[PDB]
Design a protein around this nucleic acid. Structure first.
Lengths: 105, 35, 314, 132, 138
RNA sequence: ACGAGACUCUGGCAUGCUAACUAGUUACGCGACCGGUCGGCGUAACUUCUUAGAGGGACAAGUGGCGUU
C-alpha cells in the first residue's frame, strides 16, 4: 500500500481473504486514500487484479485495486478527468493602484 | 507447500475473543514490552 | 444629439442582430445573426410603411455565427461560427458556395484582407501564420506567442494601407503595421474584454473599453501611456462615427454615446413598453446603430417582437 | 425531483463569484461562458451549472446572497460601512434624564451640566407582565 | 442549390420534389377522395377551397410515397403540403404570405411538425416483457 | 472519504454539417400518341428517406401561483 501511494496513486485497496489461521476464513481489507466503486469511471480510473496464493493449508485470495491519478497525456493514468470534478481557470491577475503608473524600460 | 506467518498484532486482532484469547494477549504483551 | 421616435411597429422575425457591418463596394445586402441554423437578410425601402422585410430563411450554416463581415466586395460574405468553420455566402448561385472546415482548433471568427494578401485565422495551438493566394509562406509566430485564445483580426476600414490588428475575447489586442511590424513591450493590466475595435484609416487611433471603464488609449508607434478615459460595461455592439472619431455603447435598453470633445449628451428621450405586473421583468434589447446615413433604426426584444425607429439625425 | 446536487451548486457559486461580470440573465450566454472559463467534463453537468448560475444571478439582481461574495456588493458594503452622518447622534441639544440618573450624576460630580432636562418619574410601578 | 426535405412521418415518406409544372391534384398520383384503404381521405380537400384555381397552376410536387402504416403515411401528406406551401411562398414572393398560410395550417393542427416519440421498449430479466414478471411461487 | 447523483449504453429531434457504383435521385430521357414521372439495365444534387460521426439540443430555461419568498 505504501509503495502504491508513493508511486503516485490517488488511492488503493488490498483485500486478503481466506485462511488467516484457524478453521474459519477471515478477510482483511486495507483501503488507504480515495477510490470510487460505481459508474463508468471505474473502467478507466480503477485498475484491479485478483490472485490466488497456494499455501500449505489452502488458497488465499489477494485483490488489489488502484485508482489512477488524473494525467493529461503520457498514458500513466487516464486522460479524461472524473466527470463530477469541475475545474475553474483563474481569471487574469489585476493589481492596479489608484493612479496607473507602470514600470517601463 | 508453505504457510503464512502472523504478527502478534494480527494474532490478537483475530483471536481476541476465542479459545486462544489468553495466549494471544500474552504474546502481544510480550511483543510490546518483553525486555 | 439627434431626434428619434418609434413611428410604428412590424412583426415577423426569429433571429436578432448582434454586430453591425457592411462593405462599401456592394452594400446592396445586409445581414443579421441567428441561432436557427440561419443568417437573415434585411432590405431597404426608406418609406413610412416599410421598415424591415423577411425574404429568405438562409438555412445551411453548421452553427450560429460570432460576428458578421463581408469581403471588400459584396460577392463573398465571410461568416465565422463559434467553432472554427468558415462559410462564404454568395449571390452567384443565390446561396453559400464554399464552406471550410480545415482548422484543427476552434477558431472564433474569420477576416478578409483589404488587398487579398494575408489570410489570418485564430488557431488554439498558440501558432498563428499568414496565408496568401499566391503560394508563398509569408510569416509565422513561433516564440513568445499569445497566452490565451485569439478571436478575430481587423484591418483598415477604408481604402488605405492594410494594417493588422489582432483582437480577442482574451482581453489581449495587438496592433501592427506591415512596414515596421515590431513589438515594443508586453504588459498586463487589462480590466475588460473587447468585442471589437477599429483602427484609424491613417494609423493613429485604436479605441478601447472595459467593464472598469478605464478605456486607455493606444498608438501605433509604441505603447506609451497617454490617457485612460471612462466607460461602462463590456461592449456587445459598436458603430464608429463615419465622419469623426467618437465612441458609443449601450448598457442594456439605454444607449450611451461618449464624444471625445464634449463628453455630454444633449437630449436623450426613450420609449419603453409597460405592463401591469411589477415583479415581471420587461423584455430587453441589446444595442442600436445607424447603417450608412442614419434614417432608419432597428431593434428587437426578447418577447419575439421586432421594432423599428425613425430618426432625424440633425 | 429537480434538486441540484452540491456539485453543481458549488461549481456555480465559484463561477459566479469569480466571473460575475461576464455572466448575465440569459441561459445561452451563461452556458457559453461556463464553457469558456471552466472545464466541465459533461455537457449535462455544464447545462445544470449554467441553469443554476442563471437562477443565482436572478437571486442577486434583487439583493445579496450569503454564499456568494462578488466584488461589487463587497465594495458597496465597504463604502456603506464607512458612512458617517453630518452631525453625531450623541449631539443632543437637550437630553432627557430621570431624577435618579440626575442624582447619580450629582454624586459623580457632574451637577453643572446644562444639556440635561429632568423628566417627571412614572407614577406607577407596573413593569412586569402578568403571570399565567 | 437544392433545398429538399419533402415529407416524412413515423416510418413513411412522401418525397416532394417541388418545382414548376402541371401540379394537378393527386395523392399517390390518384384522385381527390379515391384512395383504396379509404380511411383518411378528406385531409387534403380542405385548403384548396379557400384560395382558388389559379394558385395551383405552377406548383408541381412530384411525390415518391413509400411506407406502410396509416398514421405514418397519412399525416405525412399534411406535413408535405405544409412544407411545399412554406417553401414556395418563402422563395417566390415573401415569407408574410407563407407566414399566413402556415399560420392557418399549423395553428389549425399541432401534430404535423410533432411525431409520436413512443416506441417499443426493451425486454428485461425474469419476465415475459418490459414490465411483466414471471409468476413468483412460495 | 465511500454510496446517491454525476457517469456509460440506449431511445426521442435536426428542411444544419461530414457523403456513400451494395438499399434510395435523375426531364442533353426510350422500353409510349387521341403536351401526366413508366423496375436485370438508367447511378459532372457534397443527400432529404438509409447508414454513422463530429457536433447541436433540455436547463425547472420562460411565465403565473405557493413556499423562510
Amino acid at each position: 500500500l505504501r509503495f502504491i501511494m508513493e508511486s503516485g496513486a490517488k488511492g488503493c485497496e488490498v483485500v486478503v481473504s481466506g485462511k488467516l489461521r484457524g478453521q474459519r476464513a477471515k478477510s482483511m481489507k486495507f483501503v488507504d486514500g480515495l477510490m470510487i466503486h460505481s459508474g463508468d469511471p471505474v473502467n478507466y480510473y480503477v485498475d484491479t487484479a485478483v490472485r490466488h496464493v497456494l499455501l500449505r493449508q489452502g488458497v488465499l485470495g489477494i485483490k488489489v485495486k488502484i485508482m489512477l491519478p488524473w494525467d493529461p497525456t503520457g498514458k500513466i493514468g487516464p486522460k479524461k478527468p472524473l466527470p463530477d470534478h469541475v475545474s475553474i481557470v483563474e481569471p487574469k491577475d489585476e493589481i492596479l493602484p489608484t493612479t496607473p503608473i507602470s514600470e517601463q524600460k | 507447500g508453505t504457510d503464512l506467518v502472523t504478527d502478534p498484532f494480527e494474532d490478537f486482532e483475530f483471536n481476541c475473543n476465542t479459545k486462544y484469547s489468553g495466549g494471544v494477549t500474552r504474546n502481544l504483551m510480550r511483543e510490546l514490552n518483553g525486555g | 444629439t439627434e431626434q428619434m421616435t418609434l413611428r410604428g411597429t412590424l412583426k415577423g422575425h426569429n433571429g436578432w442582430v448582434t454586430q453591425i457591418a457592411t462593405t462599401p463596394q456592394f452594400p446592396d445586402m445586409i445581414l443579421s445573426a441567428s441561432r436557427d441554423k440561419t443568417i437573415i437578410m434585411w432590405k431597404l425601402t426608406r418609406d413610412e410603411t416599410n421598415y424591415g422585410i423577411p425574404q429568405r430563411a438562409l438555412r445551411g450554416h453548421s452553427h450560429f455565427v460570432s460576428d458578421v463581415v463581408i469581403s471588400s466586395d459584396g460577392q463573398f460574405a465571410l461568416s465565422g461560427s463559434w467553432d472554427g468553420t468558415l462559410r462564404l455566402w454568395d449571390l452567384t448561385t443565390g446561396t453559400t458556395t464554399r464552406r471550410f472546415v480545415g482548422h484543427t482548433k476552434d477558431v472564433l471568427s474569420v477576416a478578409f484582407s483589404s488587398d487579398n494578401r494575408q489570410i489570418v485565422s485564430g488557431s488554439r495551438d498558440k501558432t498563428i501564420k499568414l496565408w496568401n493566394t499566391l503560394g508563398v509562406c509569408k510569416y509565422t509566430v513561433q516564440d513568445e506567442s499569445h497566452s490565451e485564445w485569439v478571436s478575430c483580426v481587423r484591418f483598415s476600414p477604408n481604402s488605405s494601407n492594410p494594417i493588422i490588428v489582432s483582437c480577442g475575447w482574451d482581453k489581449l489586442v495587438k496592433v501592427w503595421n506591415l512596414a515596421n511590424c515590431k513589438l515594443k513591450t508586453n504588459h498586463i493590466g487589462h480590466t475588460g474584454y473587447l468585442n471589437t475595435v477599429t483602427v484609424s484609416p491613417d494609423g493613429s487611433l485604436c479605441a478601447s473599453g472595459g467593464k472598469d471603464g478605464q478605456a486607455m488609449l493606444w498608438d501605433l508607434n509604441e505603447g506609451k501611456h497617454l490617457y485612460t478615459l471612462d466607460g461602462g460595461d463590456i461592449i456587445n455592439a459598436l458603430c464608429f462615427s463615419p465622419n469623426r472619431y467618437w465612441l458609443c455603447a449601450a448598457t442594456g435598453p439605454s444607449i450611451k454615446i461618449w464624444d471625445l470633445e464634449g463628453k455630454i449628451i444633449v437630449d436623450e428621450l426613450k420609449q419603453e413598453v409597460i405592463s401591469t405586473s411589477s415583479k415581471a421583468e420587461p423584455p430587453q434589447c441589446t444595442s442600436l446603430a445607424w447603417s450608412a446615413d442614419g434614417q432608419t433604426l432597428f431593434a428587437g426584444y426578447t418577447d419575439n417582437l421586432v421594432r423599428v425607429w425613425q430618426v432625424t439625425i440633425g | 425531483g429537480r434538486v441540484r446536487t452540491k456539485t453543481v451548486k458549488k461549481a456555480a457559486r465559484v463561477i459566479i463569484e469569480k466571473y460575475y461580470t461576464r455572466l448575465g440573465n440569459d441561459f445561452h450566454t451563461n452556458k457559453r461562458v461556463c464553457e469558456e472559463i471552466a472545464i466541465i467534463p459533461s455537457k449535462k453537468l455544464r447545462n445544470k451549472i449554467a441553469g443554476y448560475v442563471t437562477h443565482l444571478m436572478k437571486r442577486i439582481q434583487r439583493g445579496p446572497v450569503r454564499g456568494i461574495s462578488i466584488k461589487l456588493q463587497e465594495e458597496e458594503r465597504e463604502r456603506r460601512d464607512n458612512y458617517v452622518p453630518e452631525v453625531s447622534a450623541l449631539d443632543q441639544e437637550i437630553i432627557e434624564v430621570d431624577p435618579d440618573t440626575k442624582e447619580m450624576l450629582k454624586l459623580l460630580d457632574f451637577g453643572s451640566l446644562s444639556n440635561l432636562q429632568v423628566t417627571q418619574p412614572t407614577v406607577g410601578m407596573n413593569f412586569k407582565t402578568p403571570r399565567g | 442549390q437544392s433545398v429538399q426535405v419533402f415529407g416524412r412521418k413515423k416510418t413513411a415518406t412522401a418525397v416532394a420534389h417541388c418545382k414548376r409544372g402541371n401540379g394537378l391534384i393527386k395523392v399517390n398520383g390518384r384522385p381527390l377522395e379515391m384512395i383504396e384503404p379509404r380511411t383518411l381521405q378528406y385531409k387534403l380537400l380542405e385548403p384548396v377551397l379557400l384560395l382558388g384555381k389559379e394558385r395551383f397552376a405552377g406548383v408541381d410536387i412530384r411525390v415518391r410515397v413509400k411506407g406502410g402504416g396509416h398514421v405514418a403515411q397519412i399525416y405525412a401528406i399534411r406535413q408535405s403540403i405544409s412544407k411545399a406551401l412554406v417553401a414556395y411562398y418563402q422563395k417566390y414572393v415573401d415569407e408574410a404570405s407563407k407566414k399566413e398560410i402556415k399560420d392557418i395550417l399549423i395553428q389549425y393542427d399541432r401534430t404535423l411538425l410533432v411525431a409520436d416519440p413512443r416506441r417499443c421498449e426493451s425486454k428485461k430479466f425474469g419476465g415475459p416483457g418490459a414490465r411483466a414478471r414471471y409468476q413468483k411461487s412460495y
